[PDB]
Amino acid sequence: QSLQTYVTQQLIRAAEIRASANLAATKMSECVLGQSKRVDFCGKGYHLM
Amino acid sequence: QYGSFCTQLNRALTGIAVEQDKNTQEVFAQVKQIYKTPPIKDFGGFNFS
Ligand SMILES: *[C@@H]1O[C@H](CO)[C@@H](O[C@@H]2O[C@H](CO)[C@@H](O)[C@H](O)[C@H]2NC(C)=O)[C@H](O)[C@H]1NC(C)=O
């Protein structure tokens, strides 16, 4: 029962981390490789690089 | 005799509790100041009442 609890908790944490990683990947793709127009996506104010 | 099975449940519920307030803060605390509309409603015919 203890092992089952640990495995479930780890799975949920892994899902959360995957979501964060996907957001980070999109940020790297858009705010670094080019100039973005979405406001507040690449830092407060008008984005430059 | 079942060990510390209680502590993780308490911890997880507390984590959810904090996450809710974090969500509210993130989704609404987007402006550093407070503004007020002028008492005059002269907006060229546009009504916002
Ligand atoms: C803005 O719109 C509101 C209605 O949404 C107007 O209020 C109405 O005013 C008339 C006459 O002044 C009343 O007969 C109505 O009962 C009011 N409606 C409500 C819902 O209160 C208001 O006058 C408009 N203001 C401007 C500047 O256009």
Instruction: Kindly report how far apart the N and C termini of chain A lie.
Output: 50 Å
| Element pattern of chain A in H and E | H
Put simply, the count of helices of chain A is 1
What is the strand content of chain A? under 5%
Give the largest interface pair and sizes: A-B, 4 and 5 residues
User: What oligomeric assembly is this protein in?
Assistant: part of a larger assembly
Number of DSSP strand runs of chain A:
0
Radius of gyration of chain A: 17 Å
Main sheet of chain A, how many strands, which sense, barrel? none
Q: Per the principal axes of the C-alpha atoms, what is the gross shape of chain A?
A: rod-shaped
Class based on secondary structure composition and strand pairing of chain A? mainly alpha
Structure explained in plain terms:
This is part of a larger assembly, with 2 copies of chain A (49 residues). With 49 residues, chain A is mostly helical. Chain A is built from 1 helix and no strands. The longest helix of chain A has 31 residues, at 2-32. The first copy, chain A, is rod-shaped, with a radius of gyration of 17 Å. Residues 41, 47, 49 of chain B line the site of a molecule of 2 linked components (NAG-NAG). Chain B: It comes from Severe acute respiratory syndrome coronavirus 2. Chain B: Glycans are attached at residue 47.
